[PDB]
Amino acid sequence: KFEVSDGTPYDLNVPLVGAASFIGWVVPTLLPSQIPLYGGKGLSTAFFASIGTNLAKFPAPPGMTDPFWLLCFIWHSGLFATMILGSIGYNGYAA
Amino acid sequence: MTAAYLPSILVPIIGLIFPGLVMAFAFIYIEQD
Amino acid sequence: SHSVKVYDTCIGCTQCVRACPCDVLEMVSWDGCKAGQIASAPRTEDCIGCKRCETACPTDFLSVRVYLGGETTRSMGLAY
Amino acid sequence: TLNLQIPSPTFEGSTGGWLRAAEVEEKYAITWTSPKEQVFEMPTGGAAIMRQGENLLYLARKEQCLALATQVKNSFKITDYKVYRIFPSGEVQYLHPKDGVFPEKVNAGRVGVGNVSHSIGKNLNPAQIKFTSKSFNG
Amino acid sequence: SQFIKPYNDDPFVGNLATPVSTSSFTKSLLSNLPAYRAGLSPLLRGVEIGLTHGYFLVGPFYKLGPLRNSDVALLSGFFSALGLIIILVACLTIYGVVSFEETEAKDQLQTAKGWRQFTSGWLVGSVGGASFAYILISNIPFLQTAGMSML
Amino acid sequence: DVAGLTPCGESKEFARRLDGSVKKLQTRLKKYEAGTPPALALQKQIDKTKNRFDRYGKAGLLCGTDGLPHLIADGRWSHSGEFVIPGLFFLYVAGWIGWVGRSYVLFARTADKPTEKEIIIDVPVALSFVSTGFIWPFSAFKEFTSGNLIVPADEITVSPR
Amino acid sequence: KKVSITVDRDPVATSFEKWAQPGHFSRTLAKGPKTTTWIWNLHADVHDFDSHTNSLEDISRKIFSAHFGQLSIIFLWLSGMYFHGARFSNYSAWLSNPTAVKPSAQVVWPIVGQEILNGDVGGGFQGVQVTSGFFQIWRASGITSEVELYWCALAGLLMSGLMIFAGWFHYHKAAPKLEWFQNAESMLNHHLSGLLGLGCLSWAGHQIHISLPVNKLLDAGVAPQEIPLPHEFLVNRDLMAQLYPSFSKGLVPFFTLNWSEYSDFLTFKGGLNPVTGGLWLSDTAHHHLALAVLFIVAGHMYRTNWGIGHSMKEILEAHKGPFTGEGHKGLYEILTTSWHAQLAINLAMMGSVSIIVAHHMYAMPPYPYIATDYPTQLSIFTHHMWIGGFCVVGGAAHAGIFMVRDYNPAQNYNNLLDRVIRHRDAIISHLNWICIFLGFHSFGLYIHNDTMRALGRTQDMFSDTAIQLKPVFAQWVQSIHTLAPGNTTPNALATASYAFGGDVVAVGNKVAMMPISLGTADFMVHHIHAFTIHVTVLILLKGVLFSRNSRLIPDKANLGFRFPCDGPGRGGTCQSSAWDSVFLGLFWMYNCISVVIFHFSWKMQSDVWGTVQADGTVTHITGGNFAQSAITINGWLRDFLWAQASQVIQSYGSALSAYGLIFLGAHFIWAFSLMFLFSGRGYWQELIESIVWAHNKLNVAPAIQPRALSITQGRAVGLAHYLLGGIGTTWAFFLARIISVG
Ligand code: CLA
Ligand code: CLA
Ligand code: CLA
Ligand code: CLA
Ligand code: CLA
Ligand code: CLA
Ligand SMILES: CC1=CCCC(C)(C)[C@H]1/C=C/C(C)=C/C=C/C(C)=C/C=C/C=C(C)/C=C/C=C(C)/C=C/C1=C(C)CCCC1(C)C
Ligand code: SF4
Ligand code: SF4
Ligand code: SF4
């Protein structure tokens, strides 16, 4: 019974929108590229590999020239765009 | 300087305590009915 | 409040009453002019002091005069 | 007499409406009757639709009410509007038109307030009335 | 499906009901804050608010003050926070002196006795929170270096 | 001479100013080929500088210790051409302009629409007026003495005192 | 069909009668003057067409023909620049030696000693040095002789005559109807595909067929007189294929989509040409060709007589959500009925584009030998920055004019405009708070640094050798753009600009472009820029949103867009109109653009521009003082204002003395403006009463009664002389400094 306003009950559909937007953004971004930023992997997989690499170096943050920041920014930008569009499509149309 | 303690005693008082008490009491005076 | 005076040079053209945004002025019966009416200011507690009435007055130097005085919530035009 | 049960124009609301001083110091009300539902501009910003029949609306200032009255007079030919002042105690003071006749028309019983019996050039000098409770008008 | 409605179903009040202003999350957070939470004396509202604000006040004074590169940086930062707390308590006191008439009602914040209780609670909470932050930064090297001790 | 100043034709600092100006133009002249238009222009500038300094040195102008001509304007006849005679020339031209403008204003007052005469000038009548201005002192004085220049104080609007 | 040509023939007779009736366009003004105020009013409302008549058709016809007149004036101006380049310039000598000949296309007559302004500009030439960059444009276009410049001047003059004839024809002989003007879809299709698309395509044609071979021969060292004429490059395909062998293959690779064959004259090289310091012209040719294709594609989007196409009303009305009510409904009617709304949008867009032009043109120099021409770079950056700021504020002004005049609440119920008006208080309050926050945490850093450096506490300052404010995001973006060639743009040989990082491109021992590092001072000045822009937005947006009414004045729309006040009541209602908000926002725009161009001038002189000497070291103009001095106001006052004004104040007796004279005169006009800005009308009217008594005593009082300027005119005159004085002072200071040291 989440009210989005004073008297406006609205279903946020956070599980569906989150899961569907995550899958619909991650799966197309599994397309590989041979550029050094990706390293032979897709955008999502290069991002996850960079997460593992930098978590193997805790305290020490990723450097400026490290591909982690660019991978994180592009991946989260596309994810946020997918989440916004998925929220619009599922909450509005619902069919 | 003779009585060299007097600047370090009086300058914080004159510059922080005097204006604070003046501003507080003037505020009370100008806002009371 | 502001003080609004109407002098006997008034010709009763009712322009100052029509120009008043705050309903301060009104026309009352008089015999001093050809129109048979003079402006009056019974409600100067609502006067904001905009001097639109003086702008509307056509007599050489004005018949209606606004003297700004003590400021109140109404005269300052405060919606808060 | 202000009927508090008069319906209001359909308005979506705005941040320009009345503040805490309306419920604490004084508030103003304007009522009018329209022949049809039609869109007018709010004096606080925004468009509202007045209903067919009676309309009651609340404002913070008398000038806002009279601006709305002038707008509905000159754009919709509505002249039956009434402006009231309401206090927090519940007292309603009828304001406009004060005697039922608009102030630009002469009405019997009105007495002149603030009338001076000479021209403006006949006022007294400030040095004449200094240290003295005489008015500058004489 | 409209998300913005007139505030309190009143189209002529100077406010709008928005998701930032009137959602369930906003209403829960605002009603659960100590300044608005039901069942609290004004003194305890003051205690909670003072604990929070006085606790976080130590940090900027300790890390950025003129004595920040000295061995007495934390002591100076806590003393600066205490001086700010005393100044703000004087501000609260003079606000309550000029703002409220002496009434029997004392269970509300916006009463004279209620504001005095709130000021007392805010002073005691602010001193306690600043002292707690001082203790934690004095005894934990992680807080002294803001995490750089891990590197 | 006057006020301790020296005549410019014998002041050494006047000569130093002339020499410095000529040298400053000649070092610019050195970078251009003879017969090029910049060379001719620079040589003409050198000639104008030399002629100006010669004329100023032979005019009885007084130079101070700075090396520049100083004008005397106390009324003495040995320096009447430095302020007094240019002053008479200005006063003649300015009285001409004022007289013809006043005459046009008084003509425009007689027209059907005076303001149209102010914004759209009657050019033949204005040219007649600007021709009339050569005898402006005598005409203006006769206008004054006949009561046609000054209007009395009871016919001019004034504010309440 | 629905989109058709409808015209009225001979609507307005061509006559000189109304030329003799000033104020004929206005019923108020046509009665003639009675006071001098009329005169000012006659020049003040004259091109305000909607206030003279209510017919939208007549207004649209006047607008169309006035636009033709402006195009005629612009073409005459261009023809003048080409002619003065042809006859009064050293352009051929500059073509022979670009690195040592200062461009000059103005020669003065000798009258009163002003012949000193004909400075020794090189090439055996004396004249006024010009900084508009026309020499570099003509070199990029392949103009090698002054005969071609004469022909260009003739073409400009002929186009000026054609435009002025078209204005007379399309107003006085064949005026289009209102239905012709109200085709937004057809106008957008034709102007996207035909104006921008075919224009880009034809300029790509000129670049590929003319500019590339002539500039390739020029960069190889061929003298301009031995280069073949452009038509010889057109007809001799062997001569063209000697430079670009793909021209031996003809147009077959284009039509068969074998486009990589054209890779020798359509490149994606990036960086700069090492010989000239400009962009590769092959890159510009592919750029303009790709833009032509994209624009022609975009010009087929909108619906016209045939059934295909988008309807913009449908597009607008479909985009609406739960936060926004009716959404973008009603905007098509506004933008097809109100000329002021279109002028607001287009002025805002043109101003933003001019600002983008200034940034992108300093950073990626597009013309040969323009990067090392530091006066040209500084002049064009400053000029297009000023034009952009003025146009953006004009967009706000004409938005306010739409809001007062053309806005109809009946046609605007619960759409985006109505909801913006209905939460204007929230908008303006949050903007006010963010402006105060930006002012404190940007300018108080400078104040804090002034105090710390004055108190002898250097370790307490905000600096790179002190408590640091690193611009980490911009540095990260610079690292990305430096790493981009071969990684995120794999087919680009070099970076988009060397300002992000890379090598020092130097031409003739002068830095064309080098990396522009960002430190604490760059952080502080970019957040100063953000503060000034947000405050200008606050003033202009508050004026637009409160143009019709407010809590103070509930009937402000009845008073109009431009009124002085509503009297001394309500405490005082001075400067309450939207016009007065534009009046204040012009001052704040001046402040913003002044700080922007000062940042540019100091940063380029300190960290980019300079001379390259042995061992590859770069000696900058001010020797890298920006990092330690631009963190304090004292450093800006001493090391930028005091230090770099030495050239304009010691310019007397040289060719740059006109800049010293203009410097003094602009200080004078700026100070003169404060008489109008600080004073009020009643004082001047009473002083004029005394002067009227003096003229009345001599019977010389004018028939047109002299009045003091109106309150709005007092504000406008003060603002105009203020802007002229300040901009002229910066103009003279910049130009004298950069001509002397660069
Ligand atoms: C492909 C057709 C086409 C083209 C090229 C243009 C071009 C232009 N229109 Mg436009 N217009 C068109 C169709 C077109 N329109 C249609 C169909 C409509 C009706 C819906 C309009 C309605 C319209 C209005 C209402 C207005 C314009 C305006 C303008 C000018 C904008 C200012 C500018 O950048 O000028 C600089 C650009 C130039 C190219 C300068 C040269 C100008 C001439 C006329 C170009 C002619 C090129 C010619 C077709 C081919 C010869 C080139 C070569 C082969 C010899 C510009 C000249 C505005 C203007 O300023 O009007 C005067 C304006 O107010 N247009
Ligand atoms: C980024 C991914 C994405 C995109 C592009 C779309 C696009 C669309 N969805 Mg959709 N959807 C998504 C994710 C996405 N969806 C997810 C994750 C869910 C599950 C929660 C849904 C559930 C959903 C439902 C239930 C329905 C839609 C519908 C629609 C269509 C119309 C409504 C709309 O949002 O128009 C958006 C309009 C556009 C995208 C075109 C305009 C283009 C401009 C430039 C905006 C695009 C922004 C940018 C370029 C996008 C980049 C994506 C990024 C990942 C790189 C439209 C084709 C409705 C429909 O009719 O389709 C059947 C419908 O019924 N969607
Ligand atoms: C003449 C008035 C005056 C005086 C005496 C001082 C004195 C001082 N200022 Mg300064 N200051 C003043 C005016 C004054 N200021 C003004 C007008 C401004 C605004 C521009 C500032 C802004 C300013 C900043 C921004 C900072 C100082 C700091 C300091 C301290 C110097 C560094 C140090 O060793 O602190 C060591 C500090 C301590 C050991 C803490 C002392 C705590 C005191 C004793 C508590 C007093 C409580 C209160 C006043 C009780 C009375 C309340 C009543 C008036 C209502 C010193 C106490 C710095 C500082 O350290 O602040 C603490 C600092 O950061 N000042
Ligand atoms: C017909 C021309 C005319 C005449 C005869 C006068 C006469 C006078 N003016 Mg006046 N004035 C005029 C035009 C004229 N004014 C105009 C057009 C302006 C507006 C700029 C003023 C502004 C003005 C001020 C502000 C003051 C005077 C003052 C004075 C008095 C002293 C002389 C002076 O200061 O001159 C100086 C005059 C000026 C600086 C302005 C003159 C502008 C031009 C050059 C004159 C107009 C020429 C006109 C175009 C001729 C057309 C004729 C043609 C059609 C045939 C004197 C009564 C002063 C005063 O009160 O002294 C007691 C004073 O303070 N006037
Ligand atoms: C595409 C450009 C464009 C167009 C077509 C318009 C068109 C219009 N504007 Mg707009 N405006 C623009 C840009 C534009 N503006 C910009 C960029 C600004 C910001 C400065 C404004 C600010 C603005 C305001 C604030 C107002 C208008 C108004 C108007 C209307 C009447 C203008 C008039 O009669 O002036 C007639 C022309 C003049 C008075 C000439 C002005 C001369 C200037 C001030 C001095 C020029 C100095 C020169 C460049 C250098 C001199 C130096 C030398 C002396 C040494 C008209 C609809 C007015 C209106 O009522 O609209 C309804 C109004 O109040 N506009
Ligand atoms: C140098 C002159 C100057 C300064 C400092 C200001 C300052 C300001 N103007 Mg302003 N203005 C100016 C000239 C100036 N103006 C001129 C010439 C015009 C003519 C057109 C205007 C027109 C104008 C308009 C139209 C608007 C402003 C606005 C603002 C405010 C912006 C918010 C801000 O930066 O907060 C931060 C405050 C500052 C940067 C002021 C200096 C404070 C520094 C950081 C030190 C503080 C130290 C501390 C207080 C010391 C205490 C000591 C104790 C003893 C008191 C701010 C109050 C806008 C506004 O009010 O809305 C936000 C706005 O809308 N101004
Ligand atoms: C991070 C987080 C994620 C993003 C979103 C976000 C929500 C905005 C953000 C939160 C930022 C902010 C909002 C984080 C929330 C922050 C606040 C500042 C935390 C305050 C804690 C106060 C306690 C510890 C002091 C407790 C008192 C102790 C026990 C005292 C004992 C004392 C008593 C009097 C008795 C005597 C003994 C002593 C010792 C003197
Ligand atoms: S000043 Fe304004 S409110 Fe007061 S009487 Fe005159 S018009 Fe009415
Ligand atoms: S406007 Fe002047 S003349 Fe007319 S009624 Fe009012 S006071 Fe009298
Ligand atoms: S000072 Fe001028 S602008 Fe201000 S209220 Fe008075 S007349 Fe109007």
Numbering used by the authors:
A (entry chain O): 29 to 123
B (entry chain I): 1 to 33
C (entry chain C): 2 to 81
D (entry chain D): 4 to 141
E (entry chain L): 2 to 152
F (entry chain F): 28 to 188
G (entry chain A): 11 to 189, 192 to 754
From the paper:
Photosynthesis converts light energy into chemical energy by two photosystems, photosystem I (PSI) and photosystem II (PSII). Among them, PSII splits water and generates electrons, protons and molecular oxygen, whereas PSI transfers the electrons generated by PSII to nicotinamide adenine dinucleotide phosphate, producing reducing power to be utilized for the subsequent CO2 fixation. Both PSII and PSI are composed of a reaction center core associated with outside antenna proteins which function to harvest light energy and transfer them to the reaction center.
PSI-ACPIs were purified from Rhodomonas sp. NIES-2332 (Materials and Methods section), and its structure was solved by cryo-EM, which showed that it contained two supercomplexes, one with 14 ACPIs and another one with 11 ACPIs. The structures of PSI-14 ACPIs and PSI-11 ACPIs are solved at resolutions of 2.08 and 2.14 Å, respectively. In the PSI-14 ACPIs supercomplex, 14 ACPIs are named ACP-a to ACP-n, and another subunit ACPI-s is also found, whereas the PSI-11 ACPIs supercomplex lacks three ACPIs, namely, ACPI-e/f/g. The 14 ACPI subunits form two layers surrounding the PSI core, with the inner layer composing of 11 ACPI subunits (ACP a-k) and the out layer composing of only 3 subunits (ACP l-n). NIES-2332 PSI-ACPI structure. Among them, ACPI-k showed the largest shift, as it is translocated outside from the PSI core, with a translocation of 3.2 Å compared with the structure of R. salina (Zhang et al., 2024a), and 1.1 Å compared with the structure of C. placoidea (Zhao et al., 2023).
